[PDB]
């Protein structure tokens, strides 16, 4: 699957100003991850971090298609890849 | 994973004119598939079909991130989801 590896220095997200749809301000937390299934070396990619949800801890990761959708002429497309530990 | 189900009427691709990069004409074969992991009901989505590669036969499917890439501000994105039977 879309494996990943949350580096040891990427176990904590960051709080950054944010606004859902110009309705209310939301300083969601963002984190990082390292994907390799598409590149031997790890690629530090971004990963949203839900409030209650704690930054992606250390452990092999696997993106989640819970963020993917089907449509647009019938073409699958991620809407916000939900990362998760490889299990 | 991104499961799928190639319907019984979607076991054959179609030959349609095509052009890689304005270099040469390529009538690649395209097929279809039904994804549900993002919707109880199956969603008929498109799926490229390599020449030698035979249309996606009947059997649970799972998209392949072999078509995904990491970059663009660090955002994973499919470049041409490679479908494969769920195994």
Domain residue ranges in chain B: 1-87
Nearest CA of chain A to the CA of B24: how many Å? 24
Q: What is the Cα–Cα distance from A34 to A42, expressed in whole angstroms?
A: 5
Q: What is the Cα–Cα distance from B70 to A47, expressed in whole angstroms?
A: 12
Q: How far apart are the first and last CA of chain B?
A: 10
Q: What is the Cα–Cα distance from B61 to A46, expressed in whole angstroms?
A: 28
Q: Do B74 and A46 touch (CB under 8 A)?
A: yes
Q: How many Cβ atoms are within 10 Å of A78's Cβ, its own excluded?
A: 21
Q: What's the Cα-to-Cα distance from A16 to each of A13, A49, A59, rounded to whole Å?
A: 10, 11, 25
CATH code for residues A1-87 = 2.40.50.140
Structure tokens, A70: 């089907």
Q: How far apart are the first and last CA of chain A?
A: 10
What radius of gyration do chain A's Cα atoms show? 14
**Exposed e or buried b for every residue in B17-33, given b needs 16+ CB within 10 A?**
eeeeeeeeeeebbebbb
Half-sphere exposure of A67 (CA within 13 A, CB side): 16
Q: What is the Cα–Cα distance from B61 to B57, expressed in whole angstroms?
A: 9
Q: Do B46 and A2 touch (CB under 8 A)?
A: no
Beta bridge partners of A44: A34
Beta bridge partners of A32: A46
Q: What is the Cα–Cα distance from B6 to A14, expressed in whole angstroms?
A: 41
Using the structure block, give the residue that is written with the tokens 């809407």: A79
Contact in structure between A86 and A58 (CB atoms under 8 Å)? no
Structure tokens, B86: 């769920």
Experimental technique behind these coordinates: NMR
Nearest CA of chain B to the CA of A18: how many Å? 17
Q: What is the Cα–Cα distance from A62 to A87, expressed in whole angstroms?
A: 8
Q: Do A65 and B39 touch (CB under 8 A)?
A: no
Q: What is the Cα–Cα distance from A72 to A75, expressed in whole angstroms?
A: 6
**Pairing mode, strands B60-64 and B68-69:** unpaired
- C-alpha B76: how far from chain center: 17
């Amino acid at each position: 699957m879309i494996k990943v590896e949350i580096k040891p220095s990427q176990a904590q997200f960051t709080t950054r100003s944010g606004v859902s749809r110009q309705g209310k301000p939301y300083s969601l937390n963002e984190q990082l991850c390292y994907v390799d299934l598409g590149n031997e070396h790890p690629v530090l990619v971004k990963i949203t971090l839900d409030e209650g949800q704690p930054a992606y801890a250390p452990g092999l990761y696997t993106v989640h298609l819970s963020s993917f959708k089907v449509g647009q002429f019938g073409s699958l497309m991620i809407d916000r890849l939900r990362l998760v530990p490889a299990k």
